């Protein structure tokens, strides 16, 4: 999540998929898993990745100022693209609250911790219909917390 800064100096545009012919992609309000629907490339998964110091912090852009955060739905909290209506306030480091992620990249594939140290846990749906999921339990036969990390187009 960066408001331009230096001109022509590397935009951090990020995309996520997996080697079993599966991809992450936004339709209206959620990043769908594996392979649902994409008729003539009307999706655009490019998000700006900003780190605290060792890779972990937050995500933002998806067309025009949509911030990927751990949002509060009363008692529950899931991954959401909230519309940020301010170009001046953009966090470089930030403290532990329901808004960051620990990106645990084990060489070619990662996992997403939520809030940051406490909060919610790293997975995504297995087949072509449900989305990205910050769950209540680890990988004890649950979902896909082993997904490949790709940059730009």
By what technique were these coordinates determined?
A: NMR
Structure tokens at 87: 């170009």
Intra-chain end-to-end CA distance of the chain, in Å: 18
The Cα 141–Cα 56 span in angstroms is 25
Residue 134, Cα to own-chain centre: how many angstroms?
A: 10
The candidate with the shortest Cα–Cα distance to 68, out of 93, 88, 45, 41, is: 45
Query: How would DSSP label each residue in 29-46?
Result: SSEE-SS---SSS-----
Assign 3-class secondary structure to 88-144: CCCCCCCCCCCCEEEECCECCEECEEEECCCEEEEEECCCCCCEEEEECCCCCCCCC
Pairing of strands 13-18, 147-151: antiparallel
H runs (alpha helix) in the chain = none
Angle, CA of 67, 68 and 74, to the nearest 5° = 100
Do 79 and 115 contact (CB within 8 A), yes or no? no
* CATH number, domain containing residue 103: 2.80.10.50
Look at the alpha carbons of 120, 75, 63, 4 in this order and tell me if their dihedral is positive or negative: negative
Q: Which of 134, 114, 119, 139 is nearest to 56 (CA)?
A: 114
**Alpha-carbon gap, residue 63 to 144, rounded angstroms:** 26
Number of domains in the chain: 1
Half-sphere exposure of 77 (CA within 13 A, CB side): 20
Contacts with 123 (C-beta within 8 Å, 6 or more apart), sequence order? 111, 133, 134, 135, 139, 142, 143, 144, 145
Q: Show the domain range for 39.
A: 1-153
Q: What residue has token string 């995309």?
A: 15
Q: Give the span between the Cα atoms of 83 and 64, in whole angstroms.
A: 8
Are 78 and 71 a contacting pair, CB within 8 Å? yes
């Amino acid at each position: 999540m960066r408001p331009s800064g230096r001109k022509s100096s590397k935009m951090q545009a990020f995309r996520i998929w997996d080697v079993n012919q599966k991809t992450f992609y936004l339709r209206n309000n959620q990043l769908v898993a594996g392979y649902l629907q994409g008729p003539n490339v009307n999706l655009e998964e490019k998000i700006d990745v900003v780190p605290i110091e060792p890779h972990a912090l937050f995500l933002g852009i998806h067309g025009g100022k949509m911030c990927l955060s751990c949002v509060k739905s009363g008692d529950e909290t899931r991954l959401q693209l909230e519309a940020v209506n301010i170009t001046d306030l953009s966090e470089n480091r930030k403290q532990d609250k329901r808004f960051a992620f620990i990106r645990s990249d084990s060489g070619p594939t990662t996992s997403f911790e939520s809030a940051a140290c406490p909060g919610w846990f790293l997975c995504t749906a297995m087949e072509a219909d449900q989305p990205v999921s910050l769950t209540n339990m680890p990988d004890e036969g649950v979902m896909v917390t082993k997904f490949y990390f790709q940059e730009d187009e």
